[PDB]
């Protein structure tokens, strides 16, 4: 769906923060205990060219830490998660030093499982980054969007 061209996996490595997120269905992010309300923390590239991901998400009245592996495919900036439903991740854009934009969908239902996020290197609000995020979203069927504050980023599961 018009994603970034070639991506330098080696440079997206390091710490990140989930500044803002959006989804095609409200239920996807509505309520903190959402199925797609995840928070990226670390991106660790593997030797085989894959990308390990350290993240947090609500699960039965408790924030849980999880390590996911997005396997690179025969498509530029598109990886795949071996988890059920076959969630696909697409890197829309990134400057490597400040922001990164991606979306994730489940092949099973590529209509009611499209979530996108705007990541950043420092726990600050990057207005210009959000800008590119809003711009890249005006063409998607998002029916819910959230944006966080520096203080909210201080929470494993965001205040």
């Amino acid at each position, epitope marked *: 769906t018009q994603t970034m061209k070639g991506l330098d996996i080696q440079k997206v490595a390091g*710490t990140w*923060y989930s500044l803002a997120m959006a989804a095609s269905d409200i239920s996807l992010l509505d309520a903190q205990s959402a199925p797609l309300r995840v928070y990226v*923390e*670390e991106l*660790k590239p593997t030797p085989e060219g894959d990308l390990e991901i*350290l993240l947090q998400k609500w699960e039965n009245g408790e924030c*849980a*830490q*999880k*390590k996911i592996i997005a396997e690179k495919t025969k498509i530029p900036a598109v990886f795949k998660i071996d988890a059920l439903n076959e969630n696909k991740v697409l890197v829309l854009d990134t400057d490597y030093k400040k922001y990164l934009l991606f979306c994730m969908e489940n092949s099973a239902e590529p209509e009611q499982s499209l979530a996108c996020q705007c990541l950043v290197r*420092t*726990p*600050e609000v990057d207005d210009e980054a959000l800008e590119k995020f809003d711009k890249a979203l005006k063409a998607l069927p998002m029916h819910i969007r959230l944006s966080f504050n*520096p*203080t909210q*980023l*201080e*929470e*494993q599961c965001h205040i």
Partner: antibody
Amino acid sequence: QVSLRESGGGLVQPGRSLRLSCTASGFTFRHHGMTWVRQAPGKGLEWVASLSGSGTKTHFADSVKGRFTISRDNSNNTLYLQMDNVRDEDTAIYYCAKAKRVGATGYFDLWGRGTLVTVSS
Amino acid sequence: DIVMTQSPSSLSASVGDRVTITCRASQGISSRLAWYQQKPGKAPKLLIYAASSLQSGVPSRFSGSGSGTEFTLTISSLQPEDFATYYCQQYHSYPWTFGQGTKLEIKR
């Protein structure tokens, strides 16, 4: 340039109170959660209290809650620890540690040498 | 309170062999475990976090693995300066707990 220097430690009498301060440098202080870890003479590490980057979120250990108060000053890059009504069990080397993220992350990539607090009469 | 038990408490290995320290939690703690290194009168150093993520500036010979309840810190090419006390710490729930620690001296 990145380092953590704690100070304030010394001899303190049972029941009295002392203030420990930790000076940071080489990184952006408000962007990291800070924590205090201590070590009693010839004993293992023990987590004391934690604080987020903003400092609006703090956490203490039961053995010190109500007596110790953690605080931070994002202007002078200083991390504080207020020890009130000190018991003998508080004798230890108080270490200053920096969290990887803005919140009390749980793991700390930067530590200081620590300051020895001896509570006796 | 989650109780972290390290093992062995002390070890002696010749510079060069690979060493392995184990750490077990009193309950599942996901992959939220870290490994610190502390030397006499020096500032502890973070080696591993998230069970297997290697802190920047730490030699690749240090590795970490494990999940659920059992975790392990491995040191490949043991060096003469790898001598120290290693501690594991969990951050799944409060209070955050440390392991009694493992003291590693260099065989010589």
